[PDB]
């Protein structure tokens, strides 16, 4: 670690720094200890002998930084400092960050330049990079101070790439964590960093996609729709949902369906977000698999134009927008009869916003202005 | 602070 | 009256946090969209009064408010506006109040807030919370319709100016916001906009609002829209103080916020004024009302409909 | 032929275009067996609503809510297990809400089935559930196993026993939790043996699970599983294991303990208790998470006063205070807080002498803490020291403390010390009140907060209840009288406001000749709030009055009310007429 005692005998040496550097200071809550300021220094060092000097990981360090990341990193994570319930909006505010962070920020940032390594041997290190490491690193997703998270995210998604032994057990345990939070916690603050690894996960599938993965897209992500905070995730989830999409087509009628099923009552920023991502879906639908759920469809979005929240009604309405959505519609008859009623007696006078008035007005418009010329 | 329409 | 008896049992009711029917609420609000549509765009208000600023839906801290300085009929009230988004308890806030109008309908008085309106309704607190409350939009289409009818401004003993918002330079003469037309739904520009979602500030002249809209006015113009008009103080509620109570203007005009620290999760004291017999003023100062079944209802909560 | 109406006609909605048009059918299923035939619900009602709606969740959660309620609409305890079909399939659901019914819906019905229906029916419903092919099945099961167990054979017994097993090392920490919270409700399902037997190694295994949210779960159910009957058999047992939770790196388990840590105690026995949960608790009291101490301190006094003998007093005083006198100066605002919810009730337990050597300097520290809530915490218990330690030394230390606090910037502070004024100025003050306390105990009438006026007021109903009548005469109404010039009507109501409440304790002759001529001097206020708050007035203080001097002097004052300005002066004084009876 000092790159200056020759060749040899520095193998010896980093090893006692990586326990050196594991004493760990239990207190950066309360007061002072520094000389401690070893630990940082050194490990900083240690942080450039990985990312400068070539063939120096060599296989008796790698238990040794393991062991080092693990006495360091795996601790019991603290009563979160806000008080929650059901009342308090998910837009989580006192974001207490780590104290002891000055450490750790290096602690990570090492062992993902070892990770990193050209040379980090795989095959070396699955020895030591368990299960039980994954699952350590995994409840650690479940911290508040964002840049945490930031860290894990990438950490983790490293070792998924890295480790194809790993990946099954990776999936399955970033399953029940969801699995947790939507059947009754309704708690876990990491949902966001899961998602953006599954994102990429999901993006490398492949050919016939397989069983797995189709229960995980139907079991687990569009149930995640379903939880009071969909915001604090939304975009994100919103990718994993149409990826799946974008590979298998054939999965269109029980993810549209699943939505529709999952479609909020009683919590509108949600019901927005539902057609918000409706459309994202719309844009990228086969037209053979719009015939599936063409009715149950627009049989629900009729109900948005109308329904008096102009938010909804906006977004909803604002699908006559975009040219590709409106081809499919226009390329039905079936589609204009349940969206027949709903902007009628929502259409002359009501919606005090006049914004989704004339929204309503050119809707009816561009669907009389087709082939069709039906009327009542 | 929490949304500036408004802490 | 055989109705008014049914009204203070519908108050006592609703008084421990329960809420009321849909058409109990539908039939409440059209009793009091008839003895509202009396009032004027500035009311003439009697001169011993208790005046309230913003309480955003924290019902169990408008009854501290009430622990604080008296009970509703006993005491004199009038409040800013601002009762149903940023809380909880938006439907039992605006319901008790409400109903509190239609009943003892000179003990208090309600203006109108920024917060009245339909566009702010649904883009925070209210309408989700009638939504999970009532099932329909109805008791909400009720509340938002009664708000149109709530008079823009007050006037306790022709001497003190009370408004939810603030100033605006499409008013002059007091006057003014006599010849407006309130009865609909707050729009984004003009004096009635202005009127209540305006701030002071420390920057002289006219300015730009932060909000969306409204206007910034410094000391100047408070000062002389004061020294003609009428003119010993203007009050407001709508831009949150630590205080409670804040003092700006070379004391030309109050801010009075009445919802305390929660979901004004800031951490802000609430407080009124009291205008008393002669017409001095006291500031009360009260903090958010102790809390029971505390923060958790257990987790077992229902869902969305899903 | 039939003449009325009553079977099945009213409703167009069982076939459905909505969602509440089908809710309201189930919700309405209610009266579909009874309206026709509890023969054939069985035979074709049930095989059809099986599973055959499978749309909507909330629909579900309803028809789980009817299952439960058909237990003699289809013939009752012979005919039960038809029901199990429609509500296997309801327990297999995904989201909980249902499936969390469903099962308590299968529990209600287990026990109006039959040992010999059980074994047949009920049983294999759970073997599969349990047997379940993913996790909503399995956590559903864990429930349904007290239930059927007691009544079924010993060699199914054997079998249950096996598939509880199966779940409490579930692949999957979700049923674990599950399998891990109902342990305590099964263990409680005796057979002595098998608790030993086989729980035993349950327990130990989920009590150092890999999650933290399945250790803390299985300390939850210990106190079932430790007071099951073991003892020089618990410290073998089910002992290393409980005092290996409390040092627990999660802590979240650590927590558990303590919020539980008077309950093992009465499980576990005073002989452990003094050698093995004495420095656990000495210990979670010094805990580094503060949520920990705050769930520790909670409970010194209960723990304290189901102890030992001879002991009870050394063990709370040799190893228990010295965490005390740490934690009443600790750093967190929930501790103290907490600790003064009980700490008063530490004194009748440790006795009188040593109350007022190392009890006192920590209520008269917690008195003046601050944090107002500490001391709203300590000043509720007050009553517990005054009722077992001598009053001449309570006047002594706490009433210089007492006295300030009755001024505190609190108003919920401050009404605490009017709560208690009574008994303070009762049980000491003779004489010595209306002179020490007097000019203290009237200054709430005139506080600029409400509530502390409408505590004053309260206080003197009381404060002539329990004291004389002709000093309330010569003290209290003197004063009283006095305030009716205040110029704010908030405070000139509180005349009227005591005089309503100065009635019922102070009776005719001091009411007619010197309330009285205050009140219908009042009726004549410019504001009216004062108006109609004597129109209120004088119906309560009407009764109290002589007939003769209330149809002449409290008559032609209440008519004159009824003819001018107001609303509600016009209706106070409408309604106190009839009340009164004068129209
Ligand atoms: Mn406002
Ligand atoms: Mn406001």
Redesign the pocket.
């Given at each position: 670690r000092d790159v200056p005692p020759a060749d040899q005998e520095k193998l010896f040496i980093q090893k006692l720094r990586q326990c050196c550097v594991l004493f760990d200071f239990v207190s950066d809550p309360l007061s002072d200890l520094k000389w401690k300021e070893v630990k940082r220094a050194a490990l900083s060092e240690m942080v450039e002998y990985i990312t400068h000097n070539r063939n120096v990981i060599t296989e008796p360090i790698y238990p040794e930084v393991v062991h080092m990341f693990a006495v360091n990193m795996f601790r019991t994570l603290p009563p979160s400092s806000n008080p929650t319930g059901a009342e308090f909006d998910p837009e989580e505010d006192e974001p207490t960050l780590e104290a002891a962070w000055p450490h750790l920020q290096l602690v990570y940032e090492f062992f993902l330049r070892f990770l990193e390594s050209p040379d980090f041997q795989p095959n070396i290190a699955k020895k030591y990079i368990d299960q039980k490491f994954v699952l350590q690193l995994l409840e650690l997703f479940d911290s508040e101070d964002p840049r945490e998270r930031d860290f894990l995210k990438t950490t983790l998604h490293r070792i998924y790439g890295k480790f194809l032994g790993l990946r099954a057990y990776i999936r399955k345990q970033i399953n029940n964590i969801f699995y947790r939070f939507i059947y009754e916690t309704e708690h876990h603050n990491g949902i966001a960093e899961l998602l953006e690894i599954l994102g990429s996960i999901i993006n490398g599938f492949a050919l016939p996609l397989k069983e797995e993965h189709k229960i995980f897209l139907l079991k687990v992500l569009l149930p995640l729709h379903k939880v009071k905070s969909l915001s604090v995730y939304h975009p994100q989830l919103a990718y994993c949902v149409v990826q799946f999409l974008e590979k298998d087509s054939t999965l269109t009628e029980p993810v549209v369906m699943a939505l529709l099923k999952y479609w909020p009552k009683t919590h509108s920023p949600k019901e927005v977000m539902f057609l918000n991502e409706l459309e994202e879906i719309l844009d990228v639908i086969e037209p053979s698999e719009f015939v599936k759920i063409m009715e149950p469809l627009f049989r629900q979005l009729a109900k948005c134009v109308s329904s008096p929240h102009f938010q909804v009604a906006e977004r909803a309405l604002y699908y006559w927008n975009n040219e590709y959505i409106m081809s499919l519609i226009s390329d039905n008859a079936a589609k204009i009869l349940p969206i027949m009623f709903p902007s009628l007696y929502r259409n002359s006078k009501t919606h005090w916003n006049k914004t989704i008035h004339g929204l309503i007005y050119n809707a009816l418009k561009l669907f009389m202005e087709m082939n069709q010329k039906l009327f009542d | 602070x929490l949304x500036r329409x408004x802490x | 009256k055989v109705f008014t008896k049914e009204l203070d049992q519908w108050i006592e009711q609703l008084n421990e946090c329960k809420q009321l029917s849909e058409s109990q609420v539908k039939s409440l609000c059209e009793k009091a969209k008839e003895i509202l549509t009396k009032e004027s765009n500035v009311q003439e208000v009697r001169c011993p009064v208790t005046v309230c600023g913003?309480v955003?839906g924290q019902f169990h801290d408008l009854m501290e408010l009430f622990r604080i300085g008296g009970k509703s009929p006993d005491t004199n009230y009038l409040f800013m506006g601002?009762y149903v988004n940023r809380g909880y308890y938006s439907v039992e806030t605006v319901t008790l109040l409400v109903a509190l109008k239609v009943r003892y309908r000179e003990r208090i008085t309600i203006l109108r807030?920024?917060?009245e309106s339909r566009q702010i309704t649904q883009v925070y607190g209210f309408y989700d919370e009638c939504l999970r409350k009532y099932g329909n939009a109805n008791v909400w289409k009720y509340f938002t319709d009664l708000f149109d009818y709530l008079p823009l401004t007050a006037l306790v003993d022709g001497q003190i100016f009370c408004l939810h918002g603030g100033l605006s330079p499409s008013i002059d003469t007091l006057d003014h916001i006599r010849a407006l037309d309130r009865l609909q739904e707050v729009p984004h520009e003009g004096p009635m906009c202005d009127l209540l979602w305006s701030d002071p500030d420390d920057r002289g002249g006219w300015g730009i609002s932060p909000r969306g809209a409204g206007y910034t006015f410094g000391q100047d113009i408070s000062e002389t829209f004061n020294h003609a008009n009428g003119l010993t103080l203007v009050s407001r509620?709508?831009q949150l103080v630590m205080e409670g109570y804040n003092w700006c203007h070379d004391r030309n005009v109050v801010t009075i916020f009445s919802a305390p620290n929660y979901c004004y999760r800031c951490g802000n004291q609430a407080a009124i004024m009291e205008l008393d017999d002669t017409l001095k003023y006291s500031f009360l100062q009260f903090d958010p009302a102790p809390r029971r079944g505390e923060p958790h209802v257990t987790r077992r909560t229902p869902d969305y409909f899903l | 032929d039939d003449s009325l109406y009553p079977i099945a006609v009213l409703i167009d909605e069982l076939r459905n275009e909505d969602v509440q048009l089908r809710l309201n059918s189930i919700k309405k299923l209610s009266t579909i067996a009874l309206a026709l035939g509890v023969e054939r619900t069985r035979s074709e009602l049930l095989p059809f609503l099986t599973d055959t709606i499978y749309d909507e969740d909330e629909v579900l959660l309803a028809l789980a809510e009817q299952l439960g309620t058909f237990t003699t609409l289809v013939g009752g305890p012979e005919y039960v297990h038809c029901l199990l079909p429609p509500l296997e399939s309801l327990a297999t659901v995904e989201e909980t809400v249902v499936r969390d019914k469903a099962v308590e819906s299968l529990r209600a019905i287990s026990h109006e089935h039959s040992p010999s229906d059980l074994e047949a029916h009920f049983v294999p419903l759970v073997k599969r559930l349990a047997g379940g092919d993913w996790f909503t099945s399995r956590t559903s099961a864990c429930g349904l196993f007290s239930v059927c167990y007691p009544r079924v054979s010993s060699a199914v017994k054997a079998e249950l026993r096996q598939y509880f097993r199966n779940l409490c090392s579930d692949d999957t920490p979700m049923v674990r939790r599950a399998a891990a919270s109902k342990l305590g409700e099964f263990a409680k399902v005796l057979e002595l043996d098998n608790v030993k037997s086989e729980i035993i190694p349950m327990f130990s295994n989920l009590a150092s699970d890999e999650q933290d949210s399945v250790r803390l779960l299985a300390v939850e159910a210990c106190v079932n599983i430790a007071q099951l009957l073991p003892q020089e058999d618990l410290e073998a047992l089910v002992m290393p294991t409980l005092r290996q939770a409390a040092e627990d790196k999660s802590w979240r388990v650590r927590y558990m303990v303590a919020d539980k840590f008077t309950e093992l105690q009465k499980a576990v026995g005073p002989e452990i208790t003094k050698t093995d949960l004495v420095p656990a608790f000495q210990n979670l009291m010094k805990d580094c998470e503060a949520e920990v101490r705050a769930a520790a301190s909670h409970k010194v006094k209960e723990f304290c006063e189901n102890l030992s003998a001879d002991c009870r007093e050394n063990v709370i005083m040799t190893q228990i205070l010295p965490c005390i006198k740490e934690l009443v100066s600790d750093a967190n605002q929930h501790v103290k807080s907490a600790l003064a919810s009980v700490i008063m009730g530490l004194s009748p337990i440790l006795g009188k002498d040593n109350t007022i050597e190392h009890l006192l300097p920590l209520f008269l520290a917690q008195l003046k803490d601050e944090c107002p809530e500490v001391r709203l915490n300590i000043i509720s218990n007050l009553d517990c020291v005054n009722e077992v330690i001598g009053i001449r030394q309570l006047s002594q230390s706490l009433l210089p403390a007492i006295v300030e606090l009755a001024e505190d910037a609190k108003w919920r502070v401050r009404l605490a010390i009017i709560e208690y004024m009574p008994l303070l100025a009762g049980q000491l003050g003779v004489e010595f009140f209306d002179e020490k306390l007097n000019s203290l105990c009237m200054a709430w009438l005139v506080d600029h907060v409400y509530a502390i006026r409408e505590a004053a007021t309260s206080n003197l109903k009381k404060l002539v209840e329990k004291f004389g009548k002709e000093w309330a005469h010569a003290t209290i109404i003197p004063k009283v009288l006095a305030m009716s010039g205040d110029p704010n009507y908030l405070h000139r109501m509180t005349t009227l406001f005591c005089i309503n409440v100065l009635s019922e304790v102070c009776g005719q002759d001091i009411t007619t000749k010197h309330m009285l001529p205050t009140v219908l001097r009042m009726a004549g206020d410019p504001v009216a709030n004062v108006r109609f708050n004597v129109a209120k007035s004088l119906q309560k203080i009407g009764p109290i009055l002589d007939n003769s001097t209330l149809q002449s002097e409290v008559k032609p004052i209440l008519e004159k009310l009824t003819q001018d300005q107001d609303v509600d002066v016009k209706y106070f004084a409408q309604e106190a007429l009839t009340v009164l009876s004068l129209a």
């Open positions: - | - | 913003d955003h601002d807030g920024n917060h509620a709508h | -």
